[PDB]
Amino acid sequence: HWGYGKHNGPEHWHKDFPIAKGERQSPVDIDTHTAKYDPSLKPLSVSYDQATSLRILNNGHAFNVEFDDSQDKAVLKGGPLDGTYRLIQFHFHWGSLDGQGSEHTVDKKKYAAELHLVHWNTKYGDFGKAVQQPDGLAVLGIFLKVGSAKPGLQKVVDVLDSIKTKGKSADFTNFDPRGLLPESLDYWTYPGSLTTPPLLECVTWIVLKEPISVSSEQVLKFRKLNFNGEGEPEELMVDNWRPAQPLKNRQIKASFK
Ligand SMILES: COc1ccc(S(N)(=O)=O)cc1
Ligand SMILES: COc1ccc(S(N)(=O)=O)cc1
Numbered sequence: 001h002w003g004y005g006k007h008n009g010p011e012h013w014h015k016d017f018p019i020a021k022g023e024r025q026s027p028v029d030i031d032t033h034t035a036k037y038d039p040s041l042k043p044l045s046v047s048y049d050q051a052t053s054l055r056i057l058n059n060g061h062a063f064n065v066e067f068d069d070s071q072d073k074a075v076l077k078g079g080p081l082d083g084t085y086r087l088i089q090f091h092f093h094w095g096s097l098d099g100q101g102s103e104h105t106v107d108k109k110k111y112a113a114e115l116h117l118v119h120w121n122t123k124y125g126d127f128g129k130a131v132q133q134p135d136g137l138a139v140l141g142i143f144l145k146v147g148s149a150k151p152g153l154q155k156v157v158d159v160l161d162s163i164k165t166k167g168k169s170a171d172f173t174n175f176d177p178r179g180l181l182p183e184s185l186d187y188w189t190y191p192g193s194l195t196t197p198p199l200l201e202c203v204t205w206i207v208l209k210e211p212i213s214v215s216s217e218q219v220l221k222f223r224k225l226n227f228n229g230e231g232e233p234e235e236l237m238v239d240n241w242r243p244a245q246p247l248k249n250r251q252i253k254a255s256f257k
């Protein structure tokens, strides 16, 4: 099965997912000097006040905090997006050490971790149909750097001991994802893909420029999770990030002048 190790990591994925070498793969390095301000971008609207979180799951690659997406409870609109995109889940990618962990990089800088808030375009009815479309998904990416603690992350941190191994889940109701945002919504945007198999080229990426700060203790608890299932030899869930992929025939646009 695909993973992040030497024998099943990103350099192997193309053998079962040939789109891994495609024209629109993610993540990418964001060259800030090359990225151009785009006056055609509309204001970005993150509308999470009615979000309904349900559950947190260790899926063997990361942990997903899942939302009720049966209605427009928590949506992303505006910016580069045409129409309404509905929040389905968020997850993170992180490193074994503070100096790596993000998927996107900024002028080749790697952050300690990266948060992905995943949304699907409601014109396509369901996530499964959305991932058949070139504008099916919008992922809001947020970098994490290590410094002061992020208070709105602590509830996530504290439940991780209950989902240590692959396949474990726990109730995770009444979690407010607004507490994971930075102050500014300045962003870069480009067309890309899922960063894990099946690597589908369906994503409008919106990557915020301002990182959030989390404490060393918070990210250390991410690193206590396990890739393995219960009873199996312990493999710490660390370095679950894909490196930057070729930009090819793309441009990164900036929301800010
Ligand atoms: C059993 O060994 C493997 C190795 C690689 C992969 S892949 N292509 O990364 O999904 C799958 C299985
Ligand atoms: C299968 O669903 C997904 C959704 C999102 C992502 S990512 N890591 O945000 O690009 C990967 C896989």
Ligand SMILES: OC[C@H]1O[C@@H](O)[C@H](O)[C@@H](O)[C@@H]1O
Binding pocket: 049, 050, 051, 052, 173, 174, 175, 176
């Ligand atoms: O409990 C987390 C969040 O859930 C939402 O459905 C509520 O409308 C918010 O007021 C609350 O902060």
Ligand SMILES: OC[C@H]1O[C@@H](O)[C@H](O)[C@@H](O)[C@@H]1O
Binding pocket: 036, 251
């Ligand atoms: O032909 C000029 C155009 O080139 C494109 O590649 C850029 O995205 C536009 O911002 C520019 O106006």
Ligand SMILES: OC[C@H]1O[C@H](O)[C@H](O)[C@@H](O)[C@@H]1O
Binding pocket: 155, 159, 171, 172, 173, 174, 175, 176
């Ligand atoms: O908000 C997410 C979770 O945070 C804490 O774990 C609370 O104890 C729990 O009730 C809640 O579901």
Ligand SMILES: [Zn+2]
Binding pocket: 091, 092, 093, 116, 195
């Ligand atoms: Zn991701």
